[PDB]
Design a protein around this ligand. Structure first.
Ligand code: HEM
Ligand code: HEM
Ligand SMILES: C[C@H](O)[C@H](O)[C@H]1CNc2nc(N)[nH]c(=O)c2N1
Ligand SMILES: C[C@H](O)[C@H](O)[C@H]1CNc2nc(N)[nH]c(=O)c2N1
Ligand SMILES: CON(C)C(=N)/N=C/CC[C@H](N)C(=O)O
Ligand SMILES: CON(C)C(=N)/N=C/CC[C@H](N)C(=O)O
Ligand SMILES: [Zn+2]
Lengths: 407, 411
């Protein structure tokens, strides 16, 4: 019941005790493992609140102090009365840093404690949300020297007054279905792109159109807004040895900023909480560019390289994959936009795991997400056993608002 | 109740009911997933149920469930168990059993082939020398001059746990590992311990980078014995690259026949502790893992040096570039010598088709995603995007401890 994890390349064995503090369910049972599935009252609120405050006061070496006992009463009285409660700033900051700390799918968590938290709980309108977001984007972009940040909008009330960013990331490219049957731009965003168009956006109908923000305050209908282009840092993609690479016409944006998730802290639900850090190269080079259902450029790149595309066993896909990812790296580096390669990231995450094992007694890690989608086994995370479990505070998925929202 | 898996690339949704016929445990609980953990004397008491379940399966497969021959077989197994404590499989039940253990191996990407398996019945074997003869026949049959054929050889089942047949090698064919006084390793570092055991048992070691290990064989719970596979039976392939002429001068080769020999086969509750089986290699096994694991041959530096890559920063992706070239070389070398091999694109595509067939015909297909997805180019193979349910079905192959860890030395 104290569990061991072995690294098979180093034989380093770590003992996990943090899992016993585990809260939610995984989706697995003793009969069936669901490891590779993508999506596997006043009465409820007080336990959740207490559980959170207890770990907060423990973290600041004040467990069982009068300041602890007092906050616990003050929160309880506020729930008994208002049916919700408000977090102190210090708790909000702790809660967000820790939700990132607990994110089992994030390889970048060595960074978890440098998070700039922007408290937007005073926001009331879409225009206000727009101001907050532009500010986050500029702050985080930092002219290419990216800094992690989250912006937190007001917490859920009766669930008819939700704040929501409808975008899946603050910045993403448009996707359009054509008469052709094919898809122009990013096919991941086809549906959102049509919701924007349906709302009244004028699409340039190109390959890399930055989507408009679609913002919903206090449960109202959402509203379109263009992010000032001078705030959207983008990198043209070239290759350090293939001169023709630039003619492929590829670019990507510098700032990854997930915006459709829900932050839960002490039973409280923050349904609009966009956060951002910086890219690992493979996210763009392998997934965004090469997934068959994304930009799908392997065919075209291989041609420019004059590889034998006649049989799979030439490994032409694999060969092209590497060059594309060399190119993503080289470009961001050339332009001084922060980016991390998969070797460095995974090495860092291993050191993070070791840190957490000795300091916290463990680290929840979803191996399926942690191992990069190229060159898996030449990264140390491949050989690392990982235990996956759910801790709060957390980031959780939540339904796309268009299936829910009342118009 | 039914369970769905989705392919995120095609939106194809599958429904699994087969997991309902699982009972063995996974290592996971509702609070912890152990999906990436490598490793997460039976009495009459347990035995008849395990026998019954298996024979109910066998008899349904052959469309004879509830038949007179079905019922008589249950009754006869029942009587044999109570009289003798154990029972013997018929030849047909053994064949069906070994095939189904392959079919249910959730870590095998090659299962499209599950029904084409040559079963060698070595249940009459009594000595190590007898084991050696059986294994040679296996290797010559499976090898077939490069045109590989899947096969398994099944030595007598466990009785009291004191009379076990064991193949002490982890594969029938594999290279020696030698730890030097300077702390480096010559040959394969995966095989250092087993190599040391062989030497202690009397093996004269050539001490090279690719010495084919001797078979170390145990019959009927006796001290195991050494045997040299005849070299003319060991197909090996020198590794060269179609465009890099210096590649051959690295001096790499590999054997063509992968044959796992240290697993236990369970059929209707019986335990076959020596059951070596073989098919053919997926290229990444040798190219990615055997050559490129840091704990294995570890050739990335030597290779990349030769390619004159920028080795001064990881972000050149010099490792990734050399890895691809090494894998191209492995597949080129095998195909040029007409030894069967499969690339990872081809093997994963076939597996997805196998998997869907199995959902439609069988009601499911247990798969372990962590193992199925190849250790290079993960997401450009269709399995990466395929959700999978992992669970334990019988008949099965299982791990078992290395025999030097349990064996009582006779002398
Ligand atoms: C600072 C640099 C960071 C790096 C290099 C990094 C790395 C990654 C990578 C590679 C993924 C997989 C994403 C995908 O495959 O789509 C990921 C997922 C995740 N990251 Fe991090 N991350 C970083 C910062 C952050 C921050 C600041 C937060 C929250 C405050 C965070 C929370 C998460 C969450 C919740 C997921 C899973 C998203 C999902 O399930 O779709 N990351 N991260
Ligand atoms: C026909 C050619 C075959 C191919 C291309 C194939 C493919 C693979 C690959 C790539 C692995 C992963 C091995 C590793 O990473 O160490 C594997 C594992 C496995 N395969 Fe297959 N296989 C084939 C035939 C068979 C046969 C004939 C059996 C037994 C009847 C079998 C049963 C297994 C089992 C039990 C494992 C798990 C081994 C372990 O956990 O260490 N395979 N196979
Ligand atoms: C089916 C499978 O779980 C799915 O493809 C996962 C696998 N691993 C992943 N890993 C990361 N980092 N990102 C992803 O989107 C996925 N997709
Ligand atoms: C800890 C981790 O599960 C381990 O390294 C696994 C991952 N996936 C694998 N997949 C295959 N095919 N072979 C392996 O040896 C491994 N190793
Ligand atoms: C916000 O999370 N971070 C910092 C990150 N690197 N990646 C997030 C998801 C981005 C997505 N994989 C993409 O490729 O755009
Ligand atoms: C026995 O299973 N088969 C046929 C197979 N392809 N792989 C078996 C293990 C081989 C091991 N990974 C190796 O590289 O030697
Ligand atoms: Zn699990």
């Amino acid at each position: 019941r104290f569990l061991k994890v072995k690294n098979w390349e180093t034989d380093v064995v770590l003992t996990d005790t943090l899992h016993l503090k585990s809260t939610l369910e995984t989706g697995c049972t003793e009969h069936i493992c669901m490891g590779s599935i993508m999506l596997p009252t006043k009465d409820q609120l007080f336990p959740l609140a207490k559980e959170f405050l207890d770990q907060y006061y423990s973290s600041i070496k004040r467990f069982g102090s009068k300041a602890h006992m007092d906050r616990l009463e003050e929160v309880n009285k506020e729930i008994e009365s208002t049916s919700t409660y408000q977090l102190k700033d210090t708790e909000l900051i702790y809660g967000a840093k820790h939700a990132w700390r607990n994110a089992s799918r994030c390889v970048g968590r060595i960074q978890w404690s440098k998070l700039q938290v922007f408290d937007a709980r005073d926001c009331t309108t879409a225009h206000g949300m727009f101001n907050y977001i532009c500010n986050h984007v500029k702050y985080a972009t930092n002219k290419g020297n990216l800094r992690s940040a989250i912006t937190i909008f007001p917490q859920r009330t009766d669930g008819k007054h939700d704040f929501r960013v409808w975008n899946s990331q603050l910045i993403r490219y448009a996707g359009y279905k054509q008469p052709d049957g094919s898809t122009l731009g990013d096919p991941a965003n086809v549906q959102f792109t049509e919701i924007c168009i349906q709302q009244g956006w004028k699409a340039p109908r190109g390959r890399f159109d930055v989507l408009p923000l679609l913002l919903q305050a206090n449960g109202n209908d959402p509203e379109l807004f263009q992010i000032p282009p001078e705030l959207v840092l983008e990198v043209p993609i070239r290759h350090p040895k293939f001169d023709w690479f630039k003619d492929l016409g590829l670019k990507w944006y510098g700032l990854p900023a997930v915006s459709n998730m829900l932050l839960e802290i002490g039973g409280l639900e923050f349904s609009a909480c966009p956060f951002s850090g910086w890219y690992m190269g493979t996210e763009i080079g392998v997934r965004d560019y090469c997934d068959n259902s994304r930009y799908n450029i392997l065919e075209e790149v291989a041609k420019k390289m004059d590889l034998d595309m006649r049989k799979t066993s030439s490994l032409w896909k694999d060969q092209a994959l590497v060059e594309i990812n060399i190119a993503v790296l080289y470009s961001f580096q050339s332009d001084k936009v922060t980016i991390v390669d998969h070797h460095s990231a995974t090495e860092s995450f291993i050191k993070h795991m070791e840190n957490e094992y000795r300091c916290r007694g463990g680290c929840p890690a979803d191996w399926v997400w942690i191992v990069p989608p190229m060159s898996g086994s030449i990264t140390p995370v491949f050989h690392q056993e990982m235990l996956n479990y759910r801790l709060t505070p957390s980031f959780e998925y939540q339904p796309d608002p268009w299936n829910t929202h009342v118009w």
